């Protein structure tokens, strides 16, 4: 199935007493895997199986790199502010990562935002940066003038990130390659005089990705959609509802299809 690995960096200029100035966080699938921020100044695991399988020299090396990386972010956001003529507290954000599909295909991505909105979008396949405005274009020229650093990222997203991901996939395979089938249930009630609402609610399942919908008689048919939520124990839960011909909730999870017919 579809797995992922991303790394986030967040940099806040002029933070209040409790928000650290730098945060770096990495995820496999939903599960956070690494942590460092500008306060403890150490890279630490956030999953047991990250810590079980990586030696301390790993965290000693990536602590040094992350300390250095924070100093980059601080200067980078200082320079952004000056292009915009911006006093105050603004944010700089970076996301790099890659995907490996069930389909054998792979994507990779690298983007920056400033103040929470898209700023620079990398295209590893064309090896150029899509810039949102006249300021982002100025950085797009600097970055695109280093021919070698664009090949370097291209390779890191296409070769290094994928290999990291498969390493981390085997490490915690007992958690991320597992499958928790859902418990699905149909609830019917008459709400406003004359209006029956059917709720198909699913919970108890993992991975989070589930497919639920409503059909009438066998063909497709407006559907309010509930968000996939973390139950707390690390299973998930969701629902799809409609009102009101025969009707049936269809649920697809981890390749298994299930149908609940409303009587």
């Amino acid at each position: 199935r579809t797995h992922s690995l991303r790394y986030f960096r967040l940099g806040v200029s002029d933070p209040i007493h409790g928000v650290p100035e730098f945060i770096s966080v990495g995820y496999v699938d939903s599960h956070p895997i690494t942590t460092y921020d500008s306060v403890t100044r150490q890279k630490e695991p956030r999953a047991p199986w990250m810590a079980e399988n990586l030696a301390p020299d790993h965290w000693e090396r990536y602590t040094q790199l992350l300390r250095g990386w924070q100093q980059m972010f601080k200067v980078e956001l200082k320079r952004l502010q000056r292009h915009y003529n911006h006093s105050g507290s603004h944010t700089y954000q970076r996301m790099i990562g890659c995907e490996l599909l069930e389909d054998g295909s792979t994507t990779g991505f690298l983007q920056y935002a400033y103040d929470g909105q898209d700023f620079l979008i990398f295209n590893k396949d064309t090896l150029s940066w899509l810039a949102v405005d006249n300021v982002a274009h100025t950085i797009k020229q600097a970055w695109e003038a280093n021919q070698h650093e664009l090949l370097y990222q291209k390779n890191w997203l296409e070769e290094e990130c994928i290999a990291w991901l498969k390493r981390f996939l085997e490490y915690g395979k007992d958690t991320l390659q597992r499958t928790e089938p859902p418990l699905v249930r149909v609830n019917r009630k008459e709400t406003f005089p004359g209006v029956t609402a059917l709720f198909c609610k699913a919970h108890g399942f993992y991975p989070p990705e589930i497919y639920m919908t409503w059909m009438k008689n066998g063909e497709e048919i407006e559907i309010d959609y509930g968000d996939i939520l973390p139950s707390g124990d690390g299973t998930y839960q969701a629902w799809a509802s409609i009102e009101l011909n025969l009707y049936s909730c269809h649920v697809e999870h981890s390749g298994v299809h299930m149908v609940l017919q409303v009587p």
Partner: antibody
Amino acid sequence: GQNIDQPTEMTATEGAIVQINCTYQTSGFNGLFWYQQHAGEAPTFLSYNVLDGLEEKGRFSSFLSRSKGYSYLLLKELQMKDSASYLCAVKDSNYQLIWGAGTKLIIKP
Amino acid sequence: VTQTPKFQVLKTGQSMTLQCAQDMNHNSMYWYRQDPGMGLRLIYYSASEGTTDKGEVPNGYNVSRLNKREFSLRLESAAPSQTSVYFCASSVWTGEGSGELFFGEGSRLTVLE
């Protein structure tokens, strides 16, 4: 674990062509550098390869093959000035450098 | 990069401090030693101002990253095994695949009994 093998010494003739090989069994890869270091001087950056290709600055050219796992540094129309050591080094998954022991090139007049 | 001294005679047990600095506005600085027939070997490095960490052959040495400019190496009790030629180097950052190394002229150390 991580080995870098390049020949110890090589000898070519002024005006000819030589090819220095750098074979790398690292774990992870983030590029391959070529440095020159004259007799008793510092090493200086020559070239960088991370994707399959061959780059050419002047009479020096750098070739990389990710599949078979080697690079070479190509020197055309050799001159006496090209006597030097040629250091090849690779970045691993964690961005450390693993250095080759170098290759000393002799240009016979 | 600029480093001093180019050469030094040392009596065993003496201490010595080797110096380095760059006005390239670089963030990383490294300290290598070059021994016959083997790679450059890292002693300590400084990923950016405010941190330092050991490298390959740290024993017998330590380092201080005085500021973004200067980074010095220190032999505590000079051993004959530390006779070598020492190299200081800076890169713009660390963890960028493309950025190369810029090297100082070298420092030839001779430890004698």
